[PDB]
């Protein structure tokens, strides 16, 4: 049925001419390339019964006038429980070997997002274990979480800790989606998943750096399509982890040029807002089920005004910004406590003490940041006695936010310490009130509890 011929090829885009019937948009085409077949995706209808298609794999080898067949439906994927504990392709194929999948049901990649009124309003937090996050920017169950970070400021590390804290010792289903990041991390994770035993409940999809643009574009969806199935069909709460969602929006720009679209600011595609909305709004908690998504956002050249990171901000309930200034200062996790915010931080949700303390440390840290200009050129001795005490407390609070990570145990050589929400608020309160003014600032780094902070101060004295 519906067989056509290739008119012209242009890197990652191919133009095909159909004699009779023309395939609808997002339909999957197939060409019999040398040995293995290649999958293409139709995008535009040009004219003279011709369609412009983006390839899902390398186009090297394609001649002009080759045969190509329409499937009719979009790219459909094995979906359901069959996929669990197996790494999947962009096309939905298993790349882990270990036989073919036990696929019962199927479902297309491209499908409209949940309409208004199908959505549900839930505003309950959950402790991550991480002090800076749990206090200032607490994550929300069934919410969209965002991890903004420049090149190598510990955003992938942070994910690996969050899956280790949340998805490890909990009964719920999980989903991971590798998008245009390291293939090393793929093997590293798949090993750590199996040996830990989380592999069983979680499902993996991968389309990494090595993969062409078309692949990196659509992998973001397939994994989401899998995550959608569990909140819909089974009606079960699922977790979705993506790294890195930027690489999806990035791929767009590589393709957009070839589709002949007029470039917008910083040579991005002009449909950046909608192309991202058509994905991001699909990642949401409905009535039928609930998805808690935690996706990482790469910031190119540490430039958050860049339109790719800029637009993503307006799709998130909680956001955790990672600053290079903090990482360089030698503090991990390198979380900016002022730039990072969450919708849940309100008396309604977190209570009185949580909110009261959270706003107080922000006020102190803000004042430290204000005076940081003057101190840089003159010194600490010049600023008034009133400021002097607030600065000294700020530097301790700032360093207390640092704590060792279980994933980075091999790195740091320290037992990563999970701190509960109630013991964090206790700590930042005692430090603020000035009951730990006697303790040095070098007794707060990579500690955890405040009880352990004083233990480090006594360890010195010996």
């Amino acid at each position: 049925m519906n067989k056509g011929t290739i008119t012209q090829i242009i890197s990652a885009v191919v133009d095909i001419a159909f004699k009779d019937e023309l395939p609808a948009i997002y339909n999957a085409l197939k060409v019999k390339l040398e040995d293995k077949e290649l999958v293409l995706e139709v995008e535009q209808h040009l004219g003279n019964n011709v369609v412009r298609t983006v390839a899902m794999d390398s186009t090297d080898g394609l001649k002009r006038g080759m045969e190509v067949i329409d499937t009719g439906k979009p790219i459909t994927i094995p979906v359901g429980k069959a996929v669990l504990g197996r790494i999947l392709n962009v096309l939905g194929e298993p790349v882990d070997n270990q036989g073919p999948l036990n696929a019962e049901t199927f479902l297309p990649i491209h499908r409209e997002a949940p309409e208004f009124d199908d959505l549900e309003t839930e505003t309950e937090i959950f402790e991550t274990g991480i002090k800076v996050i749990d206090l200032l920017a607490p994550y929300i169950k069934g919410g969209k979480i965002g991890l903004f970070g420049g090149a190598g400021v510990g955003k992938t590390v942070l994910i690996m800790e969050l899956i280790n804290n949340i998805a490890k010792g909990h009964g719920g289903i999980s989903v991971f989606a590798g998008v245009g990041e390291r293939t090393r991390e793929g093997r590293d994770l798949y090993g750590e998943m199996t040996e830990s035993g989380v592999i069983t409940k979680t499902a993996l999809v991968y389309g990494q750096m090595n993969e062409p643009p078309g692949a990196r574009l659509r992998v973001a969806l397939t994994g989401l399509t899998v995550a959608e199935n569990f909140r819909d069909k089974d009606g079960q709460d699922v977790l979705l982890f993506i790294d890195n969602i930027f690489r999806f929006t990035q791929a767009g720009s590589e393709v957009s040029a070839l589709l002949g679209r007029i470039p917008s600011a910083v040579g991005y595609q002009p449909n950046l807002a909608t192309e991202m909305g058509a994905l991001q709004e699909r990642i949401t908690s409905t009535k039928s089920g609930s998805i808690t998504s935690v996706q990482a956002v790469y910031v190119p050249a540490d430039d958050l005004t860049d339109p790719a990171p800029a637009t993503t901000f307006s799709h998130l309930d909680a956001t955790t910004v990672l600053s290079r200034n903090i990482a360089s200062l030698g503090i991990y996790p390198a979380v900016d406590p002022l730039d990072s915010t969450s919708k849940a931080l309100s008396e309604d949700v977190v209570g009185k003490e949580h909110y009261e303390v959270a706003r107080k440390v922000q006020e102190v840290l803000q004042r430290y940041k204000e005076l940081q200009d003057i101190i840089a050129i003159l010194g600490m001795d010049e600023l008034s006695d009133e400021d002097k005490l607030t600065v000294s407390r700020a530097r301790k609070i700032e360093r207390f936010f640092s704590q060792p990570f279980s994933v980075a145990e091999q790195f740091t050589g320290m037992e990563g310490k999970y701190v509960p929400v109630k013991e964090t608020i206790r700590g930042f309160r005692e430090i603020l009130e000035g009951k730990h003014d006697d303790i040095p600032e070098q007794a707060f780094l990579y500690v955890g509890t405040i009880e352990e902070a004083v233990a480090k101060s006594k360890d010195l004295a010996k």
Partner: protein, 471 residues
Amino acid sequence: IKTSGTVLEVGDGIARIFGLSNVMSGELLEFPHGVMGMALNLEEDNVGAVILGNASLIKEGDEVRATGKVVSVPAGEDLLGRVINALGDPIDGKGEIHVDKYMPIERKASGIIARQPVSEPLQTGIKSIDGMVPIGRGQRELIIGDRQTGKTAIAIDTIINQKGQDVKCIYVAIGQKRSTVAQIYKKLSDLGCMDYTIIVAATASEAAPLQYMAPYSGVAIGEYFMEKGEHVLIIYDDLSKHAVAYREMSLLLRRPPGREAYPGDVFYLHSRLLERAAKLSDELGGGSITALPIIETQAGDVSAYIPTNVISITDGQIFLESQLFNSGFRPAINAGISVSRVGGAAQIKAMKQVASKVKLELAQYTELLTFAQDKATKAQLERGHRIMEILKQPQYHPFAVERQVVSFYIVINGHLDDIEVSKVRRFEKELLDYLKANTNILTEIADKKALDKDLEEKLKESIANFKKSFN
């Protein structure tokens, strides 16, 4: 071919159509599978028309019928308390709306004679605004600031303090997240401020033309009430995203790019929208439609193309800085840059009597604070700290106009200078309780809407005796 044609090309939510001989500009087109469009580029041979929603369904050959109608929004009193899309179709998912009249989306703003000077306050219920940066009915006031500075917070807080004041409200969510729009819908209906409120929604998932139209549809529904002779409060959240949608449309339609890749008429886009907001003369009812547009700055960059555009259109603006927001000054308003081009014209006489110099004092206090790192100044700086503590107030707790007058009186006339700065926030709370319970002079202030010799001497005495004990 006459009032019809066929699609010879389609992709990325636009379609070049052959035929449609006598198709007019901005005409509503009908495609198969019950999807809509809009003809814009009426070129020599083809017709560039943008598609609303399900564009993926369309393909080459599909027949296109011309309605011979301008795109129009259904407007009625039935809409109140319900959520609407760009077109007017209800997405609340709880019944259907029926309207008496059908009003057009795009339409010219009123004339010079049509209007009259604004001279009646739209009380937001925020001390720091209604005091020193007041808003009037028919005015356009921008709420500009960085991400997460409390822009929408001010928007809704305004809506909250329009219960009983008898003013319709329209929250236009442009390029927002459906999840976020739901949060708004709930908090309004929870507080019971939804039944005199409408929500127009063109979320990020929805196509650019629907986002583009959203605020024009929103204001047309506002015009219905205005023409009848009723006061309206429309809100655009936010025009910075609205612009990006128009950018999408243009660059796909092949209308060439300008500065920051935005098309030529991104000023005119927001000019004709905001101008539409006005107060009409008594001859045409005297019905108003106040507009509060929102803008999202990038790291406090107001030199950017759109933020600067909108500032020059509106009748003043409100600036929010995270330097204050994080410092613990909410709502984080910068008095220095924030101005209202209507001034005390849109204020009750009682308010003018107290909150006149307060803006200048704070602007001068801002300067002298940098120096303090004379004994007359040491007094001014003391009043500075105290003024700000009052201007600081929480969310979802808008003050009545009468409660504002007394709050400004106590600090300005110097009945707050001989107590601790930490307790001034608590002082005004206990005073408003004591004055409501015992004296019952707030009801008089509300009725009189002025400060008589009686009321001032009543305050003078009732404040003096209140200081018998400090908590």
